[PDB]
């Protein structure tokens, strides 16, 4: 009666409205406190991400074959009971699977039998008695796995994951402040491309990070590294173009980073960098540069070297005057300059054309120059500033900006 009533209550029409899109721009429906999966949910054929979150012990029927587009399932505290035809359909169709659990029994055993699975995310502590890195021994059956996120607070990387790493291209570890025992055991995953150690609290860089040659993006988020000293060995990483050293106690940048000329997305924000030096600008390839929430003394002139810079973010840092060399570059697009001690914005911002948004709220900004109206791509949504400071502009250029905004 409950399931039949749920099919009537949750109708296909209301669920068509329930359909939303995620950051990956994928049609998805969030099933929160549902008794089971309504048949009206499975009738949907345009679904991309089905969110079985907190659905108590739901049995998956074969009608999941109707979900032809189904590629993403996020079983959040939802034990999935499945049978052979639905198993076959998931093995032949399903490719990404983010299992969040609080118990070993919550993890279903059929998730290790899927052929086409390539993205697998685990959340929940995995250290247990007589089950440490044994339940995932079925990861060897899964040969298509490329993304393996383990928000499992694990103290060491499992060896089965190391054998998987021959075909794994992405390994993100979240330990929530627990030091992971590296022992240079990640040298097996030569295919690893994005090692994102999230909240690993490493405080050092092991040699395995720069021993593998295949990492393009290495984000040591909240790894608490005091001194960034292993960056000389990263020049052998020709693939490395995104070295996001944010959320650390880096108090000074040694000049040696001038070795790494291939870097583009250097996100060095939310740190206590006393100053980014001139030699830091020796990487002319830097296209995206984030220094937000930092202790900079000022912003040097060698920023004129970074001709490829698009978004320079120094929000809530200590910069008193904006150098004209900042405006010498023309490729700036997103200027996160808010909450600063900028005395005034120079009129040379009129040179900037690619600037589509600029954060100017707060600061010590005396007035906004009229040259901001010279920027074509900039609009009201792009130009975020206080109402009075915006009103300091002449009426007709404000009308021009309004007309370019609304249309």
């Amino acid at each position: 009666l409950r399931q039949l009533n749920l099919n009537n209550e949750w109708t296909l029409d209301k669920l068509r409205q329930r359909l939303t899109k995620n950051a990956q721009d994928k049609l998805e429906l969030h099933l929160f406190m549902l008794s089971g999966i309504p048949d009206t949910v499975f009738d949907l054929v345009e679904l991309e991400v089905l969110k079985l979150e907190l659905i108590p012990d739901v049995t998956i029927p074969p009608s999941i074959a109707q979900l032809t587009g189904l590629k993403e399932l996020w079983l959040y505290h939802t034990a999935a009971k499945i049978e052979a035809p639905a198993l076959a359909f998931l093995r032949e169709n399903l490719r990404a699977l983010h299992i969040k659990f609080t118990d070993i029994k919550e993890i279903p055993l059929w998730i290790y039998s899927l052929k086409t699975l390539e993205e697998l995310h685990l959340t929940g502590n995995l250290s247990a008695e007589n089950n440490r890195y044994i339940v995932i021994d079925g990861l060897r059956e899964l040969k298509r796995l490329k993304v393996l996120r383990l928000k499992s607070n694990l103290s060491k990387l499992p060896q089965v994951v190391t054998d998987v790493g021959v075909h794994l291209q992405k390994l993100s570890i979240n330990n929530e402040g627990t030091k992971l025992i590296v022992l240079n055991s990640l040298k097996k995953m030569v295919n690893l491309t994005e090692l994102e150690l999230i909240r690993c609290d490493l405080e050092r860089i092991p040699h395995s990070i720069f021993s593998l040659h295949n990492l393009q993006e290495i984000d040591l988020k909240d790894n608490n590294l005091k001194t960034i000293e292993e960056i000389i060995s990263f020049q052998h990483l020709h693939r490395l173009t995104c070295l996001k050293l944010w959320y650390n106690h880096i108090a000074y940048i040694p000049i040696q980073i001038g070795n790494l000329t291939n870097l583009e997305r250097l996100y060095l924000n939310r740190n206590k960098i006393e100053k980014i030096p001139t030699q830091l600008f020796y990487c002319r390839k830097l296209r995206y540069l984030d220094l937000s929430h930092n202790n900079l003394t000022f912003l040097p002139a060698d920023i004129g070297l970074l001709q490829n810079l698009q978004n320079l973010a120094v929000t809530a840092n200590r910069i008193e005057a904006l150098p004209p060399e900042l405006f010498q570059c023309r490729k700036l697009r997103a200027l996160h300059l808010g909450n600063n001690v900028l005395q005034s914005l120079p009129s040379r911002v009129g040179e900037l054309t690619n600037l589509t948004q600029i954060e100017l709220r707060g600061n010590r900004l005396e007035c906004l120059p009229v040259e901001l109206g010279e920027c074509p791509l900039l609009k009201r949504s792009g130009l975020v500033v206080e109402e009075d400071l915006f009103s300091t502009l002449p009426p007709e250029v404000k009308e021009r900006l309004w007309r370019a905004d609304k249309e």
């Binding site: 939303t20 969030h30 929160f32 929000t315 808010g338 909450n339 009129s347 954060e359 709220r361 707060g362 005396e366 007035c367 120059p369 009229v370 109206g373 206080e386 502009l393 002449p394 009426p395 007709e396 250029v397």
Partner: protein
């Protein structure tokens, strides 16, 4: 049941929809006329600011320890309760507070157990027995407080401010017709830097302001300053660069302005000034001078002394004569002379290289000269004028001006 309803009513996706930004560039959740505070709100951990408007009978659990990213709290006309872990965490984390006390009890008594608090927005109202508010004089427990804005009918400055003068820096008070008295409590300000008093009905500038030796700026907004004779001690405010005495009644300006030359910002808009003296423009460090919507008869030529001026507003004056020495001052970035009694725009105006803004709106002009092309930073927007004055440029000058 109330809390269960709150969690059931507001899904986290609805809170994602509610997510917005505020006046301080923080992630704000506007919660309006709610029955309580849901735990789903605290499930969001990326949140930087909380806005609770008339949500009364509300007790803050330990669950706010989930969201570490908070920096601002807007507790508006709501009587809020507290729990021990909430006290500890908001002592450790919360820094910016903005409360509205429509009722005195709608101000909760626990704001003052904190220490990390830095900004405070005390909007609302107050009664006759001002000194009895022990809620004010507990900010001795606050060590990091730096911003205090009290929009209330406060007649007497409390001894609270006297105690917290060591670390306080900014004042913003809107009395709205209420006379402010007992100015010794503002005398014993020591480390304060900003003072914005609005409608405090201060007839004269007290010796309190001159007792301040590190005041960056002063505002005497909506204060009936008929005469300015106590400026002699204003020299003690060496940090004073801003004197925003606008919408005021200063009938004439004396020689005492020579006491302080560090003055930079000078707003006398809508003042009662009749003739400027020879003694304003001696202080060459002045860059930001306002006389908007005044009734000055004419501008004497001693304006030539103000070279480091970058803003000279005298808009809606009765000034019929602009001598050419303000055109001689080329560092004058802004220069607003709108709706005066002037006759002709100066032909030798292209000499002012750094003239960013020339508001001369509504002036009785005849024909614009051709030397606006020599002006590097003057636009049609900058030179706001009636359109029959805009239509006067030569055709080649139109070709050079439409392309700037």
């Amino acid at each position: 049941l109330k809390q269960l309803n709150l969690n059931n009513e507001w899904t986290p996706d609805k809170l994602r929809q509610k997510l917005q930004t505020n006046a301080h560039n923080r992630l704000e959740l506007p919660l309006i006329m709610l029955s309580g505070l849901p735990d789903t709100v605290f499930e969001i951990t990326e949140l930087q600011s909380l806005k609770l408007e008339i949500i009364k009978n509300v007790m803050i659990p330990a669950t706010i320890a989930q969201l570490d990213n908070l920096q601002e709290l807007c507790l508006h006309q709501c009587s809020v309760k507290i729990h021990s872990a909430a006290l500890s965490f908001l002592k450790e984390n919360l820094k910016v507070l903005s409360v509205k006390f429509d009722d005195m009890r709608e101000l909760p008594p626990w704001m003052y157990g904190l220490r990390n608090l830095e900004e405070l927005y005390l909007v609302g109202s107050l009664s006759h027995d001002i000194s009895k508010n022990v809620t004010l004089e507990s900010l001795r427990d606050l060590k990091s407080l730096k911003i205090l804005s009290i929009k209330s009918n406060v007649s007497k400055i409390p001894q609270a401010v006297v105690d917290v003068s060591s670390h306080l820096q900014k004042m913003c008070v809107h009395n709205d017709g209420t006379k402010l008295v007992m100015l010794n409590n503002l005398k014993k300000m020591t480390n304060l830097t900003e003072l914005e008093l609005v409608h405090c009905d201060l007839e004269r500038i007290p010796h309190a302001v001159f007792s301040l030796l590190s005041l960056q700026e002063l505002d005497l907004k909506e204060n009936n300053l008929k005469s300015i004779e106590e400026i002699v001690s204003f020299q003690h405010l060496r940090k004073l660069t801003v004197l925003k005495l606008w919408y005021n009644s200063i009938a004439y300006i004396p020689e005492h302005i020579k006491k302080l030359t560090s003055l930079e910002r000078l707003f006398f808009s809508h003042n009662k000034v009749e003739v400027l003296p020879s003694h304003l423009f001696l202080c060459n460090k002045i860059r930001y001078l306002d006389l908007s919507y005044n009734d000055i008869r004419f501008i004497p030529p001693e304006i030539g002394v103000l070279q480091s001026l970058q803003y000279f507003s005298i808009t809606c004056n009765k000034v019929e004569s602009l001598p050419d020495e303000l055109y001689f001052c080329k560092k004058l970035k802004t220069l607003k002379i709108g709706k005066n009694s002037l006759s002709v725009l100066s032909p030798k105006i292209g000499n002012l290289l750094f003239l960013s803004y020339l508001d001369i709106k509504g002036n009785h002009f005849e024909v614009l000269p051709p030397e606006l092309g020599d002006c590097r930073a003057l636009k049609r927007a900058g030179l706001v004028v009636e359109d029959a004055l805009f239509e006067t440029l030569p055709s080649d000058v139109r070709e050079q001006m439409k392309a700037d």
